[PDB]
Amino acid sequence: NAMSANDKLTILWTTDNKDTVFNMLAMYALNSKNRGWWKHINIILWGASVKLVANDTQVQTEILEMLQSGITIEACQDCCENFGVASIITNLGITVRYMGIPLTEYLKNGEKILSI
16 A cells, blocks of 8 residues: 555644754754655644744754755744744745644644654
8 A cells, every 4th residue: 555654754843942943853854854764754833933933043044954855844824924924934945834734634644743
């Protein structure tokens, strides 16, 4: 059946704790992608994290490196619109879309999801 069933990691990134963002989340995602530990890595920006990414240039630098490595990053469009940052987030190369259906599907499909 499925040809990639154990090859994708999803991270639900809600935290705005910079220590955890830099030293756990970005470091593991980048190394995983670059070394082939995970063939596919998707990061969902939803919650306090959306404000952090919009406002913090050091975090933006990490976002750009992650995107360059082939990690996909999508942000909750409701959050982006409520916080007034959709243009900023889109301009970083992050996909902005309504996230309710996607998250539901990821969970229903039995994805491996680290909720940070």
